[PDB]
């Protein structure tokens, strides 16, 4: 909806509100079949280039099938095994005797058909390529003789077009140990993907969402290779199910908050930790530390709960009351006062220290704000770039309202001498108790 | 052989035993040649589309050769230079005058031939593509006249098939600064790779291993571009030699071990460090911290010693006796009691703290175990998924025996007040001495 | 110029001097247009394979245009937005009404033309592909009838060659959300890149530099997709401008510096931090912590200031005087004495501790130096490999002069008992004051 921002001068942090989240909570698997031709090598009298070209392209069909066969005899484990158990279970059903015969019967007349497997999964099966029809009708009557018949150059070219998708799928499945991500258009065409989305047991408001963000759907999908058996090549595409739709999502941005003394070695720093995406999820907050686990389309966010952290909903109160022991508001400390900048959703946080020249300029007006020593913030309204030292950042031109929450920087509440300057993932209340215990050691003496 | 597991309740860690390791200790280089045609651009009377198509494809042959030439005038350094010295030394020999003339003579009649270079290396050379034969026989008599002769569409298509492998190799060598990894099927076909494996100075038991794991061999190989000189395109493929075969390998899994007090801010945590693959290697243990440096095929492990750490064999005794100062059993400490789970080889470790809902469910039975506060473990026998908060993990369905080693969690042996909660790569005996020194400061006062 | 090295025995660090740097400080954008044909699907009497092949390839042209259209309706945000503001601003100008009509007029007769946009940018526009000319002249008179005319197989093949570049560009723009990097030869051919370099407002000495390192230029460039409007496909290529040329650049290499006591648990370690590339830049030093932000061609370095840190020029004095509080010479401390090696530009630093077998061998001479416990260094003159434990490193064979700066290891100046063994990003003067404060706590008692 409306993207807004709030910069907290007290903690040198910003929160971008107003995002609508789509959290993946389930998987929808689908079987993709390719009708193959069970043929063995045949040698006949061949000389003219058209016979050679067909036999050359026919061998690329042969090596592609054998490459997929030795891939399933020994399949190397992948780091995606903890996320593909839903689709891997489907490949084990197809390897059972008689199960490939079922999908082979349902896809006898149409491209799409629903198939009830022997494991209780009513999966939707597609036949995206038919090589048995082309080889047995156009190639076998030409090559299964004493001397090879002469094929036309149209047949040589038409067969290279059909065989191409098989070769490209074997290429991806071989280099990725049968589990590929994202799902390419070779694994599933955009036309096939939209038709697959439409047939999903999801709401009409949810089908419009996945259809407008098909590239994000591909990046959050898996393609799993199953088995080759009885002239059938089958592989499972594992598509995301977003059980959480239109949930509030905020992104926390943090920057170092140091003191501004004039002698280096006499300054202490403080920075909020656990920056990233926070979204309401099932009575708690799902935090996403990794940056690539949430795809954004500027109004919206698409996250995967596979790489998330479950936090109490009180964690959002660290932005308004950080000194409350009721919520573990975590920080890191040091004595490294180096200047930096963070480009937020509607502006930029600037931490300027030392002799560094920090500024924000407009392309046609020039320098419109020069930052002093400390932590500050600037809106994107009228600002194009932000320069910190010899580094120039670009400000996001997204429309929205920024709110500057003025307040005393909390680093000024700390006596420098007894400060813990080597804390990593420490809570605010944790550090204060460590300071109260270290001050008693000076009180008695 | 038999994959087994041992979960240590005292240290919240699991060790997966029974893996057979294959550690790379050497390199076997091989020269791959492509016979090129030394031709310059020729212009003749051309109009019909077949002459244009040949000249268009002929220019793609020309720009591909010139692109490889300017790549060798200035070749950017790569991060693989510390691992390709064996193959880079071979390219420098070919750049010597008269050395390319030798391999050009040995490959005069056959595709494969052994060549003794001028540096003491008896390397095996392959001729995988012959473009000089096709250009000089089928194209030059057509184009080296006053007016161009009319080539058939079979020639136009047959030349695009042969020229394709050259264009794809130049594409990989250009984007990767002459050093590509893994070695694609364009650099070396599966047929050429198996034939190359067979001719290696390794045991017959070792040839069967590399032939059943060709994809892992590709991922642990390098393709290095040499020189283009005297109508010859040569590049070295650097293949792995596994001097260590069938060595015991165990994978250590660790999870946070915290106390279970009811007031947050009064709990301390502890976690074993240096998780990853450990393998016996030459009287010591080779530890692999990076996750991608060891490829697994579920019975076996394929690691590269390039990114390994050499540890004394006593490091394995940290799983049975962690408090022994004879071996530096390292841990990290904090006060961050956040729930998490780790999917092991035969089960899952669960560290549950706070209000987090941790559970393990079966697809048809439902919740079969609910974890309480602390660190626990569950077998894969009967378990399909593990849920921690809003995150659901998939359990590996590998067959094996798990062993639950009961014991008091070592975190209970620590007084919370004087605990060091900010140690990173500290030893157990190191921390205890720091606690004995900090307790004396309270003893005197 | 001349690459030299200096190893500091006192700090276990090496500095490789003599590199000439090229720091990117600006962007030069250019518009790349592809003339498309505004056609809708037409159905006529078609049977022979040539009509089917044209209509099949024509649909791949249709889906490629529609895929680029739905990509611009909703474009996912990328992590490169902070570096593509220069090029993104150009795409917004083309989306204005009447602006695409201007470039469409300038490119009416030639491939290249300068166009003054409605935002003050005098950009250079290229027309690299003309599909409207081929479709409207060779395909529309064949297909826009009652029954389809029979096209020759030369037309079917000639159209697959022209349409291929469009399909490959749509593939890259779709998987990368309209912002691709590096810029492939499909986005911009080597012939087009060199011509684009030549027309740049840079010095003749600067054009020779970019032309000899086109692959590095591609890796530091961006390709941004603009809009499809009025039979024109336009996208911006953002090329680097190196405002800093021939600047001195040094690379700092660090290795752990531990004590050599015989009882483990009684040793302390120390390591300089902030290793990487340092270059003089505008009166300060630009430090590059990330390894991939600087491309090297062995004489030269090509860095991007987008991911850099601005430090005072006094930071170089940490190599000759580390104990001076005037510059924050930062270190990290621990008690982890594990052996390791670092391959430098002209040699190798070796930190050998414990029972580890550290050595440096020559291929024909064997072991030429055996390292003892502590930190040492070896030149590349006569050395081929360096072995530490079960790990073998390769030494860079670059020509240059090494200088061994002898000195007492600074770790011996520290009393082990009161040492801070858990400091991360701490300054030398910071740690010494923490030791002076901890010794007073023992002085009074
Ligand atoms: C967003 O802001 C506009 C004002 O520009 C307001 O009219 C609208 O109601 C806001 N949307 C929501 C969901 O509050
Ligand atoms: C064609 O086949 C015959 C056998 O039917 C064989 O004798 C002859 O050599 C073949 N022609 C070739 C191989 O060119
Ligand atoms: C593996 O376990 C089986 C029991 O299922 C046993 O018969 C076999 O000997 C074991 N293998 C080894 C190498 O001990
Ligand atoms: C063909 O070649 C002749 C010279 O031999 C030249 O005069 C003529 O223009 C050419 N035809 C073209 C270029 O179409
Ligand atoms: C590099 O070293 C050579 C000596 O081998 C010397 O002649 C030359 O002047 C040096 N270059 C520079 C720029 O100092
Ligand atoms: C050819 O077109 C005619 C109409 O003009 C139509 O009746 C006929 O069925 C077509 N032939 C086909 C579709 O094979
Ligand atoms: Zn069929
Ligand atoms: Zn951020
Ligand atoms: Zn030959
Ligand atoms: Zn693990
Ligand atoms: Zn035109
Ligand atoms: Zn280095």
Q: How far apart are CA C290 and CA C280, in angstroms?
A: 17
Extract the tokens encoding B138: 């089928």
Q: Are C325 and C425 in contact (CB under 8 A)?
A: no
Distances (CA, A) of A180 to A184, A219, B108, B332: 9, 10, 42, 35
Q: How far apart are CA C358 and CA C373, in angstroms?
A: 9
Q: How far apart are CA B276 and CA C32, in angstroms?
A: 48
Strand pairing of B294-297 and B232-241?
A: unpaired
Starting at the edge strand found earlier in the chain, the sheet holding A257-258 runs A257-258, A269-272, A330-334, A426-427
Distances (CA, A) of C66 to A152, C53, C61: 33, 20, 9
How close is the nearest chain C Cα to the Cα of B63, in Å?
9
Chain C residue whose CA is closest to B70: C212
Which chains form contacts with chain A, at 3 or more CB pairs under 8 Å? B, C
3-state secondary structure (DSSP) of residue B70:
helix
3-state secondary structure (DSSP) of residue A400:
coil
Strand pairing of C13-24 and C4-8?
A: antiparallel
Extract the tokens encoding B217: 């061999």
Q: What is the DSSP letter of C97?
A: T
Q: Which residue CA neighbors atom 14 of ligand 3 most closely? A: B2
Residue A182: asked if its preceding bond is cis (omega within 30°), the reply is yes
Starting at the edge strand found earlier in the chain, the sheet holding A374-379 runs A340-343, A347-352, A374-379
Report CA torsion sign: B180, B185, B188, B194.
positive
How deeply is A347 buried, as exposed, middle or buried, from its count of CB atoms within 10 A (0-12, 13-18, 19+)?
buried
Strand-pairing partners, residue C393, are: C386
Query: Which of C71, C81, C310 faces A391 most closely, judged by CB atoms?
Result: C310
Residue C182: asked if its preceding bond is cis (omega within 30°), the reply is yes
Strand pairing of A26-35 and A122-130?
A: parallel
Measured from the Cβ of residue A283, the count of other Cβ atoms closer than 10 Å reads 10
Q: How far apart are CA C379 and CA C398, in angstroms?
A: 11
Question: C441-444: long-range contacts (C-beta < 8 A, 24 or more apart)?
Answer: C441/A441, C441/B441, C442/C418, C444/A445
Q: How far apart are CA C407 and CA C413, in angstroms?
A: 12
What angle do helix axes C204-212 and C190-198 make, rounded to 10 degrees?
170
Distances (CA, A) of C198 to C121, C124, C203, C210, C244: 19, 12, 10, 9, 19
Q: How far apart are CA A419 and CA A192, in angstroms?
A: 61
3-state secondary structure (DSSP) of residue B16:
strand
**Phi, psi (rounded to 5 degrees) for C251:** -110, 120
DSSP labels, B268-327: -EEEE---EEEEEETTEEEEE-SGGGEEEETTEEEEEGGG-EEE-GGGGGGTT-SS-TTS
Residue B182: asked if its preceding bond is cis (omega within 30°), the reply is yes
Q: How far is the CA of C302 from the centre of ligand 11 (A)?
A: 39
CB contact under 8 A, A388 and C310: yes
Q: Does A420 touch chain C (CB under 8 A)?
A: no
* Residues near C326 by beta carbon (within 8 Å), at least 6 away in sequence: C314, C317
Which ligand lies nearest the alpha carbon of C147?
6
What angle do helix axes A190-198 and A204-212 make, rounded to 10 degrees?
170
CB contact under 8 A, C177 and A334: no
Query: Which of C50, C81, C424 faces A396 most closely, judged by CB atoms?
Result: C81
CB contact under 8 A, C310 and A356: yes
Q: How far apart are CA C191 and CA C209, in angstroms?
A: 16
Q: How far apart are CA C315 and CA C150, in angstroms?
A: 74
Spell out the SS3 assignment of A97-160: CCHHHHHHHHCCCCCEEEEECCCCCEEEEEEEEEHHHHHHHHHHHHHCCCECCCCCHHHHHHHH
For chain C, give percent helix, strand, coil, nearest 5: 30, 35, 35
Distances (CA, A) of A322 to A10, A328, B354, C166, C257: 9, 9, 20, 54, 40
Question: How open is the CA angle C312-C315-C321, to the nearest 5 degrees?
Answer: 140
Q: Are B148 and B56 in contact (CB under 8 A)?
A: no
3-state secondary structure (DSSP) of residue C306:
helix
Q: How far apart are CA C250 and CA C262, in angstroms?
A: 36
Q: How far apart are CA C83 and CA B99, in angstroms?
A: 48
Strand pairing of C4-8 and C401-405?
A: parallel
Extract the tokens encoding B175: 């984007």
Helix or strand holding residue A106 (H, E): helix A99-106
Q: How far apart are CA C242 and CA A324, in angstroms?
A: 50
Q: How far apart are CA B117 and CA B110, in angstroms?
A: 18
DSSP labels, C405-434: E----GGGGS-STT--TT-SSEEHHHHHHH
Strand-pairing partners, residue C254, are: C13
**Strand runs (DSSP E) across A159-293, as ranges?**
179-180, 222-228, 232-241, 244-254, 257-258, 269-272, 276-281, 284-288
Rg (CA), chain B: 30
Q: How far is the CA of A276 from the centre of ligand 8 (A)?
A: 6
Strand pairing of A401-405 and A4-8?
A: parallel
Chain B partners within 8 Å of C181 (Cβ): none
**Phi, psi (rounded to 5 degrees) for B222:** -130, 145
Q: How far apart are CA C416 and CA C425, in angstroms?
A: 20
Measured from the Cβ of residue B412, the count of other Cβ atoms closer than 10 Å reads 10
**Entry resolution (Å):** 2.9
Q: How far apart are CA C389 and CA C352, in angstroms?
A: 9
Chain B residue whose CA is closest to C357: B310
Which ligand lies nearest the alpha carbon of C108?
11
> Of C327, C231, C192, which Cα lies nearest the Cα of C34?
C231
Q: How far apart are CA B12 and CA B375, in angstroms?
A: 6
Which ligand lies nearest the alpha carbon of B252?
10
Q: Does C355 touch chain B (CB under 8 A)?
A: yes
**Backbone conformation region of residue A382, classed left if phi is above 0, alpha if psi is from -120 to 50, else beta:** left
Q: How far is the CA of B180 from the centre of ligand 12 (A)?
A: 21
Q: What is the DSSP letter of C316?
A: G
Rg (CA), chain A: 30
Q: How far apart are CA B72 and CA C297, in angstroms?
A: 11
Q: Does B212 touch chain A (CB under 8 A)?
A: yes
Extract the tokens encoding B398: 């590998």
Q: How far apart are CA C376 and CA C406, in angstroms?
A: 10
Extract the tokens encoding B1: 């052989």
Q: How far apart are CA A417 and CA A253, in angstroms?
A: 29
What angle do helix axes B190-198 and A49-73 make, rounded to 10 degrees?
60
**CB of A1 shorter than 6 A to ligand 1:** yes
Helix or strand holding residue B38 (H, E): none
Extract the tokens encoding C170: 């749509």
Question: C65-70: long-range contacts (C-beta < 8 A, 24 or more apart)?
Answer: C65/C36, C65/C228, C65/C233, C67/A190, C67/C170, C67/C174, C68/C170, C68/C173, C68/C174, C68/C225, C68/C228, C68/C233, C69/C228, C70/A212, C70/A214
Q: How far apart are CA B42 and CA B108, in angstroms?
A: 28
Q: Does B165 touch chain A (CB under 8 A)?
A: no
Q: Are A149 and A141 in contact (CB under 8 A)?
A: yes
Question: How open is the CA angle A335-A338-A342, to the nearest 5 degrees?
Answer: 120
Helix or strand holding residue A153 (H, E): helix A153-175
Extract the tokens encoding B185: 């099927």
3-state secondary structure (DSSP) of residue A125:
strand
Helix (H), strand (E) counts: chain B: 10, 26
């Amino acid at each position: 909806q409306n993207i807004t921002e709030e910069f907290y001068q007290s903690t040198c942090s910003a929160v971008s509100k107003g995002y609508l989240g789509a959290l993946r909570t389930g998987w929808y698997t689908s079987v993709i079949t390719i009708e193959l031709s069970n043929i063995k090598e045949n040698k006949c009298n061949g000389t003219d280039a058209k016979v050679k070209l067909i036999k050359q392209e026919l061998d690329k069909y042969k090596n592609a099938v054998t490459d997929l066969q030795l891939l399933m005899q020994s399949t190397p484990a992948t780091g995606s095994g903890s996320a593909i158990c839903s689709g891997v279970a489907v490949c084990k059903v197809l390897h059972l005797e008689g199960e490939v015969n079922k999908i082979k019967s349902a896809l006898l007349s149409t491209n799409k058909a629903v198939v009830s497997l022997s494991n209780g999964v009513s999966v939707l099966t597609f036949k995206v390529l038919d090589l048995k029809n082309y080889i047995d009708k156009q190639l076998l009557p030409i090559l299964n003789k004493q001397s090879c018949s002469i094929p036309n150059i149209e047949t040589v070219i038409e067969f290279q077009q059909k065989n191409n998708r098989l070769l490209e799928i074997t290429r991806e499945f071989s280099v990725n140990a049968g589990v590929t991500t994202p799902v390419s258009t070779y694994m599933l065409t955009n036309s096939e993907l939209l038709s697959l989305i439409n047939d999903m047991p999801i709401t009409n408001d949810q089908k419009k969402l996945m259809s407008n963000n098909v590239q994000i759907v591909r990046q959050q999908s898996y393609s799993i290779m199953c088995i080759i058996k009885e002239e059938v090549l089958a592989y499972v595409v594992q598509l995301p199910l977003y059980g959480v739709i239109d949930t509030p999502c905020w992104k926390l941005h943090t920057s170092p908050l140091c003191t501004t003394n004039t002698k280096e070695g006499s300054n202490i720093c403080l920075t909020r930790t656990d920056r990233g995406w926070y979204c309401d999820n099932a009575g708690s907050v799902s935090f996403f530390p990794q940056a690539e686990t949430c795809k954004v389309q500027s109004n919206r966010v698409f996250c995967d709960t596979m790489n998330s952290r479950t936090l109490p909903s009180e964690v959002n109160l660290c932005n308004v009351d950080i000194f409350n022991p009721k919520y573990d508001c975590k920080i890191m400390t040091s004595k490294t006062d180096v200047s930096s900048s963070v480009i937020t959703s509607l502006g930029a946080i600037v931490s300027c220290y030392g002799k560094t020249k920090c500024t924000a300029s407009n392309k046609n007006r020039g320098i419109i704000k020069t930052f002093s020593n400390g932590c500050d913030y600037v809106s994107n309204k009228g600002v194009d770039t932000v320069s910190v030292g010899n580094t120039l950042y670009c400000v996001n031109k997204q429309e929205g309202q920024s709110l500057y929450v003025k307040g005393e920087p909390i680093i000024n509440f700390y006596d420098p001498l007894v400060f813990p300057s080597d804390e990593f993932d420490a809570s605010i209340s944790q550090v204060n108790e460590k300071i109260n215990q270290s001050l008693a050691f000076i009180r008695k003496s």
